[PDB]
Design a protein around this ligand. Structure first.
Ligand SMILES: O=P(O)(O)O[C@H]1[C@H](OP(=O)(O)O)[C@@H](OP(=O)(O)O)[C@H](OP(=O)(O)O)[C@@H](OP(=O)(O)O)[C@H]1OP(=O)(O)O
Lengths: 96, 48, 87, 91, 167, 64
RNA sequence: AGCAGCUUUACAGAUCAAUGGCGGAGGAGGUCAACAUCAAGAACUGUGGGCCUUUUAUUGCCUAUAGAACUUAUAACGAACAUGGUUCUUGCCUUUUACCAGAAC
């Protein structure tokens, strides 16, 4: 997600004395910084989101792209479990 | 005319690098080419 | 650049050749799409790349070692710039 | 021609040079956890039975029925010990 | 993500995408549930080449495209806090061990498999026997066996559906 | 693949039907042109109008 | 290098009828000229055979064979680079010329 135009920046910064190859034959999957459930993460409308907001930003933008969300209506366990049980879980400090 | 002014700018700043202001740049070949190419197209127009 | 009405640094400028989706609430902003990217990969970084001509990708990095500098330095010499061959 | 989306389409017709400058001014253990703990305790008994099964099968000495009998016997023994421990802890 | 500039031209795009899917082996083209088309490629040059082929040779229609995106994946960093059942069958999950993730990413009988799991990964005796399936880097574990074996196939199918479109 | 049109504006025009654009203009009528006829076997067009004369134009050179 | 074979444009000796082989009966230039040809199914002609067209004159295709100068793949005679016309859309505008600057032909 951070590789867009990387090659062009490299080639321009080095005045043609540098070249690069980006590949994914080693399937490295890494934890995106921040938390997915941090519904209060700050997200700039136009500038790149802060490090700790990435997991939330990527989730929300994906949901809106797919039409899963109308907004801050992100994922919660309450969508699948019964409402009265989630009401308990939120008071127990598991998930608000 | 604009092309010649532009050529003079690039020529003079190449030519004058350690010489400063004043007459003396005689590298007329590029502007001369500009006027020869002007004549190439002016010829049929003036003939008519 | 002319077809895309995009002017890269030091490049020429021209009249424009031509006069729910991608809304900011649905776009992941990570890196600004530079104008240089729009000419580097004109089909990927533009939605309507009309009249675009795909460019040459790249040439192998140049390694031409320079000479004619010291009157008696030979044609073949291990220039200071080269890594040694330490095996 | 715009650069990074900023400038005019052209300076012609704008009455200006079109020169662009970057602005320097902008800058109670929930019942479900107890259920998982109880499941893990009963699972340890079943794990012991399965390990015994693995040992007997790898030794290829006993029929599948004799192995099933030894596993049921070990299961009954360990389940009785667990029920006694739960009764004692609850007591 | 892409869609045609003019909706009237959507069938031309479909035909062109089929050609692309055939001429570009490594490309993955899928129609999302929202109706927008997703193209997955190896990199910016790969996409630039296939988009040129679409606009210039196969589709010959104008196509709107998104800024570059990436394929994310969903996972867990800790064990499930509770054995919550569901209705409309409780399931739990744990972060898979790094070693097995790597070997499965490189694609590397029930008794043999149980030996592999017990010796290199240290899984317990039951886990090493009750593994029902391995799918897209995930594992399903069954831990009366006859009571459960009636619907093993349908349970596996549900797991296969879940692992390709997470919560 | 040509269309010939004549108008009260004294002009006679040839339109290339592959482009829907004017490609040839025939100048010479003193006043409004009322009629045009294309020769059946020659690359020639006949036009006439208020100036009381018929002009026969070679299509290619646009010469009357 | 010496020895051996093949080959023969040369020199010497021998031979010198015929036949065969080999070679031959202007060169370099010109800010000279004429004529032809130079942007296309990557896209060339001829000889030979077949089919079609053609109707006494030759065209097109398939097949066999011989030759394909120059020009061209980050495409083009020109490692260079002017102008005009028509149409459209713009600019400055006060009407035309003369002009702004993008497109198409
Ligand atoms: O007006 P300036 O900014 O001072 O530039 C001048 C000017 O050139 P331009 O106005 O065209 O840029 C002079 O040209 P003219 O005024 O006479 O037309 C030119 O002198 P020339 O007559 O030889 O062209 C002179 O050149 P020099 O460097 O020799 O003084 C050059 O000065 P700079 O470009 O160096 O500033």
């Amino acid at each position: 997600i951070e590789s867009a135009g990387f090659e062009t920046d490299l080639r321009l910064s080095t005045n043609g004395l540098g070249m690069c190859q980006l590949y994914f034959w080693h399937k490295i999957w890494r934890k995106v910084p921040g938390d997915v459930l941090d519904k209060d993460a700050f997200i700039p409308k136009l500038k790149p989101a802060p490090i700790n907001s990435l997991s939330r930003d990527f989730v929300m933008k994906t949901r809106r792209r797919k039409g899963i969300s109308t907004s801050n209506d992100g994922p919660t366990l309450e969508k699948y479990i019964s409402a009265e049980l989630y009401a308990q879980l939120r008071e127990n400090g598991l998930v608000p | 005319i604009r092309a010649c002014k532009d050529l003079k700018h690039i020529i003079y700043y190449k030519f004058n690098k350690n010489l400063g202001k004043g007459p003396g740049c005689g590298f007329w070949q590029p502007a001369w080419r500009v006027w020869l190419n002007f004549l190439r197209g002016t010829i049929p127009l003036l003939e008519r | 650049g002319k077809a895309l009405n995009n002017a890269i640094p030091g490049g020429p400028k021209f009249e424009p050749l031509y006069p729910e989706f991608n809304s900011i609430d649905r776009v992941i902003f990570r890196v600004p799409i530079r104008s240089e990217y729009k000419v580097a990969f004109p089909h990927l970084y533009n939605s309507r790349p009309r009249s675009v001509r795909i460019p040459w990708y790249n040439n192998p990095v140049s390694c031409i070692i320079q000479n004619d500098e010291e009157y008696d330095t030979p044609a073949l010499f291990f220039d200071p710039s080269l890594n040694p061959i330490p095996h | 021609m715009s650069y990074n989306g900023i400038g005019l389409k052209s300076a012609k017709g704008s009455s200006t040079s079109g020169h662009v400058q970057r602005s320097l001014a902008s800058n109670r253990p929930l019942a479900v956890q107890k259920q998982i703990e109880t499941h893990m305790e009963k699972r340890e008994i079943e794990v012991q039975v399965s390990e015994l099964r693995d040992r007997l099968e790898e030794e290829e000495t006993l029929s599948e029925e004799q192995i099933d009998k030894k596993c049921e016997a070990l299961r009954a023994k360990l389940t009785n010990e667990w029920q006694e421990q739960q009764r004692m802890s609850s007591l | 993500v892409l869609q045609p500039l003019l909706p009237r031209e959507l069938p031309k795009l479909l035909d062109a995408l089929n050609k692309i899917s055939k001429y570009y082996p490594g490309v993955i083209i899928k129609v999302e549930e929202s109706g927008e088309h997703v193209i997955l490629g190896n990199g910016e040059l790969y996409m630039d080449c296939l988009l040129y082929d679409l606009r210039a040779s196969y589709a010959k229609i104008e196509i709107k495209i998104s800024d570059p995106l990436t394929v994310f994946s969903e996972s867990c960093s800790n064990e499930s806090f509770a054995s919550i059942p569901v209705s409309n069958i409780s399931v739990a999950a744990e972060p898979m061990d790094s070693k097995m993730i790597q070997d499965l990413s490189r694609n590397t009988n029930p008794r043999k498999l149980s030996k592999i799991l017990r010796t290199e990964y240290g899984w317990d005796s039951l886990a090493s026997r009750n593994v029902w399936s391995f799918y897209n880097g995930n594992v399903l574990i069954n831990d009366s066996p006859e009571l459960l074996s009636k619907y093993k196939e349908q349970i596996i199918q549900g797991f296969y559906w879940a692992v390709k479109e997470g919560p | 693949p040509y269309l010939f049109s004549v108008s009260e504006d004294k002009t006679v025009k040839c339109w290339d039907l592959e482009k829907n654009q004017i490609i040839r203009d025939y100048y010479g009528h003193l006043s409004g042109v009322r009629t045009v006829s294309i020769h059946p076997t020659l690359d020639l067009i006949a036009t006439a109008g208020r100036d009381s004369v018929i002009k026969l134009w070679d299509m290619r050179t646009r010469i009357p």
